[PDB]
Write a protein that binds this ligand. Structure first.
Ligand SMILES: CC(C)C[C@@H]1NC(=O)[C@@H]2CCCN2C1=O
Length: 269
């Protein structure tokens, strides 16, 4: 199990920007840290920005993927904390998309003094529907996703990428498709299974950090009522920022709009 030190190289850690305020950018499913490329220059004039790849990214050597360890999001949390501890960063804001929003929630419970603020993009505590809980998916829907991913990964990714982007932004579709195709198909399926089975509803109240939940007008994996649920149950002061754009990947499809929200959220913490 690589130390935080060795993880700095394995997970392609980069530190850029200037200033005292540290911000971690943690990418979502199907991308790598290049997904932050379009929004990054809106932060680096006056924030010190830490970027890294999740172990499941195609830009990480697939020989490092451990199918036992990473069948729970707690192992991804371990990696994040090991990087921050290796970098000797005692306090930061954290921006997470998708699975990284879940990682950030869990990390803020594991190490409450380390996270001054959480910004969650495309975030859900639970995708499966439950009693009086609308997450957006039934068990048979997620099973069909797994079956499609395993039977024909290329065809599944080609159909999924425009749905995830949502808006008619062809470069965003191409960029998301490229990193989706860069993932090894068995690792992609494994991460998808891990995310779809996670249920964080019972620990949201243990988050102490103030939070900004960024929600678009239509997100194929996150109903608007799930953003409200996060605001209702997160333990810190929480604001939902509604972005006037469609899709699950606003950092790819609407970076200037997302940047305005991020700069307001990261101005003071
Ligand atoms: C059915 C569609 C509206 C949802 C979409 N489909 C998918 O296959 C991917 C799998 C990961 C998240 N996904 C999604 O949210």
């Amino acid at each position: 199990a690589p130390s935080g030190a060795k993880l700095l190289q394995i997970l392609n850690v980069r530190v850029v920007g200037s200033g005292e305020r540290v911000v971690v950018l943690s990418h979502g499913f199907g991308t790598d840290q290049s997904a932050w490329s379009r929004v990054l220059p809106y932060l680096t004039r006056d924030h010190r920005v830490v970027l890294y790849d999740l172990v499941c990214a195609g830009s990480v050597n697939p020989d490092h993927f451990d199918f036992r360890r990473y069948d729970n999001l707690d192992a991804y949390v371990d990696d994040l904390l090991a990087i921050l501890d290796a970098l000797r960063i005692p306090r930061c804001a954290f921006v997470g998309h998708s699975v990284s929003a879940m990682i950030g929630i869990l990390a803020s419970i594991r190490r409450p003094d380390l996270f001054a603020k959480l910004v969650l993009i495309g975030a859900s505590p639970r995708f499966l529907n439950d009693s009086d809980y609308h997450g957006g998916f039934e068990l048979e829907e997620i099973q069909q996703v797994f079956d499609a991913m395993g039977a024909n990964y290329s065809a599944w990714a080609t159909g999924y990428a425009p749905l995830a982007v949502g808006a008619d932004v062809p470069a965003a579709v191409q960029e998301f498709s490229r990193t989706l195709f860069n993932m090894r198909p068995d690792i992609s399926l494994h991460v998808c299974q891990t995310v779809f089975k996670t249920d964080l509803r019972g620990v949201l109240g243990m988050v102490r950090a103030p939070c900004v939940v960024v929600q678009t007008t239509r997100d194929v994996s996150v109903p608007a009522s799930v953003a409200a649920y996060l605001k209702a149950h997160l333990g810190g002061r929480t604001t939902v920022e509604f972005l006037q754009t469609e899709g699950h990947l606003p950092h790819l499809s609407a970076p200037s709009l997302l940047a305005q929200v991020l700069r307001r959220a990261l101005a003071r913490y």
